[PDB]
Amino acid sequence: SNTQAERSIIGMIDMFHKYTRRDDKIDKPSLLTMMKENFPNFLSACDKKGTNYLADVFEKKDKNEDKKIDFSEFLSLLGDIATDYHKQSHGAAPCS
Amino acid sequence: SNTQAERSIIGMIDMFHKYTRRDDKIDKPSLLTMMKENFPNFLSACDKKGTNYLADVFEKKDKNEDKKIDFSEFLSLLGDIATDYHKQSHGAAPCS
Ligand SMILES: [Ca+2]
Ligand SMILES: [Ca+2]
Ligand SMILES: [Zn+2]
Ligand SMILES: [Zn+2]
């Protein structure tokens, strides 16, 4: 009975919780793993452009520099990923 | 070949584009419609709590007050929705 958009959003929460530790936050190695497992085609596109997304994603998204990715920071990362697919649909090359 | 998380994100871009006008932004009536069509169970939960989400969502999310919802503002709205499901998974009542 949930819609597709609702299922999609709930899905990101459960994805998140696949990788958190007991503090409900994601550490650097867990985040790179989350990315390889859940966005391998996104990453591949970047690589083909000469961009290694995982070299700096943790440092870019760990805005408060506590060496963890919290939920708000996780959402911001999903935002960056969404934004690239949005740009592409408007014709930009991927990972622009 | 896209993963579920990748399909989910692409899905939000295409959802967005179901409701935009030629300026690639969503107007107030279109946004309320997007919400009733894609988050009816989210909204229902709110209503049961005495909260009508659509009374103020446009005004809360139209951060630059140009009377449109742009993509960045749309993402922020998805963020609010995600955040409520996250809180719930940690035991909060919905639409808290
Ligand atoms: Ca952090
Ligand atoms: Ca606006
Ligand atoms: Zn959590
Ligand atoms: Zn667009």
Side-chain angles (χ1 to χ4, degrees):
Chain A
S1 168
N2 277 316
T3 67
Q4 172 64 55
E6 286 168 337
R7 298 183 160 151
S8 269
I9 296 243
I10 294 174
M12 292 301 155
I13 281 53
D14 294 334
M15 186 176 68
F16 185 72
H17 282 155
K18 273 182 58 177
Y19 298 99
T20 45
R21 303 211 132 193
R22 303 214 191 218
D23 58 355
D24 196 43
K25 308 172 185 200
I26 297 181
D27 64 23
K28 174 156 189 178
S30 290
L31 195 81
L32 306 200
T33 296
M34 185 273 294
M35 290 292 296
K36 286 136 150 185
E37 283 181 350
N38 291 283
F39 302 97
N41 303 283
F42 176 79
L43 291 174
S44 166
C46 284
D47 283 325
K48 313 191 201 247
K49 286 315 203 33
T51 288
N52 189 181
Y53 206 82
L54 312 186
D56 69 330
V57 63
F58 191 87
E59 286 71 49
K60 295 295 207 301
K61 301 321 286 175
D62 182 10
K63 187 187 130 96
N64 64 347
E65 283 186 75
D66 62 356
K67 297 277 192 163
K68 312 295 221 161
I69 298 298
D70 62 28
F71 194 67
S72 68
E73 297 164 346
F74 173 67
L75 287 179
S76 166
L77 162 64
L78 293 189
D80 294 336
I81 297 165
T83 294
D84 194 82
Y85 284 112
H86 186 231
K87 284 186 189 177
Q88 295 183 50
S89 72
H90 284 254
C95 205
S96 58
Chain B
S1 168
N2 277 316
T3 67
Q4 172 64 55
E6 286 168 337
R7 298 183 160 151
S8 269
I9 296 243
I10 294 174
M12 292 301 155
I13 281 53
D14 294 334
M15 186 176 68
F16 185 72
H17 282 155
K18 273 182 58 177
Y19 298 99
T20 45
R21 303 211 132 193
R22 303 214 191 218
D23 58 355
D24 196 43
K25 308 172 185 200
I26 297 181
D27 64 23
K28 174 156 189 178
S30 290
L31 195 81
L32 306 200
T33 296
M34 185 273 294
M35 290 292 296
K36 286 136 150 185
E37 283 181 350
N38 291 283
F39 302 97
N41 303 283
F42 176 79
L43 291 174
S44 166
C46 284
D47 283 325
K48 313 191 201 247
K49 286 315 203 33
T51 288
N52 189 181
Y53 206 82
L54 312 186
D56 69 330
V57 63
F58 191 87
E59 286 71 49
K60 295 295 207 301
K61 301 321 286 175
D62 182 10
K63 187 187 130 96
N64 64 347
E65 283 186 75
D66 62 356
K67 297 277 192 163
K68 312 295 221 161
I69 298 298
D70 62 28
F71 194 67
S72 68
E73 297 164 346
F74 173 67
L75 287 179
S76 166
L77 162 64
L78 293 189
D80 294 336
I81 297 165
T83 294
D84 194 82
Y85 284 112
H86 186 231
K87 284 186 189 177
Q88 295 183 50
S89 72
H90 284 254
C95 205
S96 58

